[PDB]
Design a protein around this nucleic acid. Sequence first.
RNA 1: AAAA
Lengths: 82, 82, 82, 82
Amino acid sequence: DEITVVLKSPNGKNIKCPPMPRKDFSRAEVLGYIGMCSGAQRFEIASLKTPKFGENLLKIIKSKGSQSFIVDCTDEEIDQFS
Amino acid sequence: DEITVVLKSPNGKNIKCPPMPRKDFSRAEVLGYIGMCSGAQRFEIASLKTPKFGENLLKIIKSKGSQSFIVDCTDEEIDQFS
Amino acid sequence: DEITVVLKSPNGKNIKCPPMPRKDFSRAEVLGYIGMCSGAQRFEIASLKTPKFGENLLKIIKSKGSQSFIVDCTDEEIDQFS
Amino acid sequence: DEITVVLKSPNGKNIKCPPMPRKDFSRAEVLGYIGMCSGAQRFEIASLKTPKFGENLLKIIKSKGSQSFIVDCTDEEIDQFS
RNA sequence: AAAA
Ligand code: NA
């Protein structure tokens, strides 16, 4: 399949990481793709701490077809991947 | 199931990471959840070096139902996730 | 099998990481081998952000025999692993 | 089983990480255990770059009983885990 | 290596 990790701030700013196959989808892989987007500096994303993220992840785990995984950044956080 | 990683200092301070399913429970995933709690700064937790941690982990690996995994922080260490 | 991660800048500079078996080949393992090459400092590689990398990875996933995985570094990036 | 990662410098200095079960043994897990020993600071170990490490790892992967995995540190490197 |  394909799963596109999307960094999104309430701006409406998008950053679409290259897609990953559903076979590979996990929490580790999602933060793996984001780290690749941000580079050598470790990133900060407050929303990772919240339970939504884990629910939104289990949600896509149980879906059909190609999906898009949204990860919520502040307007300040999303400038790490710009 | 659910497994809640709990950061706990001898204060009695709790920090409950969002739960993870038993299917996903591992050492890598536990430090993964904690890192998400601490953010972009790598954390220090002395108790990770001790064999208790590994035993306490194998313990929960072999349990039934939803469990809670306690990770012991100094009173100073737990301020990383506060 | 064997899969040799090769860091390559348009110079034509090679850096060959020790090989990994196809059974172990993944995105996580590739960045794992590179990190081992670079050491304690987190590395920067711009090409990781691009979709080529993910395609070039799925490509080798679906191959026979021993392959070589090329990872494109700027001429400045490849000095991290030298 | 058990597999004890041992940091060893030519001094003869030992540092024994808590054991891991053979079911869990990998390159990722070995550097995972070492990181836990070193803490919040990323560690440097030159020997990780060499092919010996990968051979010495495949070696233990194909063994019976409980083994000990030796990781070679300079006399200066081993002070990271002391 | 906890995102390598
Ligand atoms: Na990792």
